[PDB]
């Protein structure tokens, strides 16, 4: 077996490195996105908005949207595949949970009519081709850059976006006599899968009314467990009871930030230049060759 033409040690480090790649703590390439026109009162990146009770799922195709003469003006008309009725205006379309799967070959007016249908007719549109990263913005920082709905609809397939989400836990509470403002912070783009898989602690403060704040998280007990060092060289956790062999750290998928590393002291010096004495033989005619 030509072992991929590699070292014997290089495969042993490769078995550790594959545990690092499939780890959910670094897999922050988020695919899937949801255009929805629900309000924003408590911002948190974990919020995946629930589909309401009476919506009908419709798979997207090019057959649905087409131009039609409606009221002295060519309007782009949706044909709802359960009933088959024609719906020319976005002000009165029924509640459709459209699931866009391709977003290719799609017109710009059709993408205009869907995002108009979300705001006007309260649609919920899932799109499963948008890949993006996420940075959780602190509330004093604010949203540095936005993402247009023209780019979320009219874009090539393999473009990697960057959405900014805000942790609204540490927002300053207004005073008890301040007259209110006017506009509300709305929100158009939401995630499908949970954001902040890299999160360990959150909101290290002390709220004055209750003991611990709403939704603040503690570090996991596996992040502090050193454990011992095994005889083979695999990092173990602490034993959970008496007479229990500890769990090796490369089997479970938690993260341990304290580990026993075998390191050499100043009395080893691996790989210096050792010095020998060489003594040539006496005669060249006296050197035995065979049978040896």
């Amino acid at each position: 077996w030509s072992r991929y033409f590699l070292d014997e040690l290089r495969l042993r480090r490769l078995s550790v490195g594959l545990r690092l790649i499939t780890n959910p703590r670094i897999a922050r390439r988020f695919d899937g996105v949801r255009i929805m026109y629900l309000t924003d009162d408590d911002p948190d990146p974990d919020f995946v908005p629930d589909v309401p009770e009476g919506y009908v799922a419709v798979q997207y195709a090019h057959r649905l949207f087409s131009s039609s003469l409606a009221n002295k003006r060519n309007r782009v008309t949706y044909t709802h595949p359960p009933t088959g009725m024609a719906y020319p205006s976005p002000t009165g379309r029924p509640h459709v949970h459209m699931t866009i799967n391709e977003r290719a070959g799609m017109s710009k007016l059709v993408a205009d009519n869907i995002i108009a249908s979300v705001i006007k007719s309260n649609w919920v549109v899932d799109i499963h081709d948008i890949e993006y990263t996420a940075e959780v913005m602190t509330p004093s920082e604010g949203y540095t850059q936005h993402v247009d709905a023209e780019s979320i609809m009219t874009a090539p397939k393999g473009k990697l976006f960057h959405l900014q989400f805000m942790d609204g836990l540490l927002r300053p509470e207004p005073s008890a006599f301040d007259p209110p403002a006017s506009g509300e912070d709305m929100r158009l783009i939401y995630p499908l899968q949970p954001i902040s898989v890299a999160r360990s602690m959150r909101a290290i403060v002390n709220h004055n009314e209750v003991d611990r704040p709403r939704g603040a998280v503690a570090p996991s007990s596996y992040e502090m467990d050193t454990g011992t060092l095994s005889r083979n060289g695999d990092l173990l956790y602490s034993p959970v009871a008496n007479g229990q062999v500890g769990i090796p750290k490369l089997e479970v998928d938690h993260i341990s930030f304290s580990n026993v590393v075998s390191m050499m002291t100043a009395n080893i010096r691996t790989g210096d230049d050792m010095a020998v004495e060489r003594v040539n033989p006496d005669d060249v005619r006296a050197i035995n060759i065979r049978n040896a």
Binding site: R25, P139, S196, R199, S200, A203, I204, V205
Partner: peptide
Amino acid sequence: LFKYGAAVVNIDL
């Protein structure tokens, strides 16, 4: 590093 006022704490590369 975990000074009073840490909003989020991430584990990244």
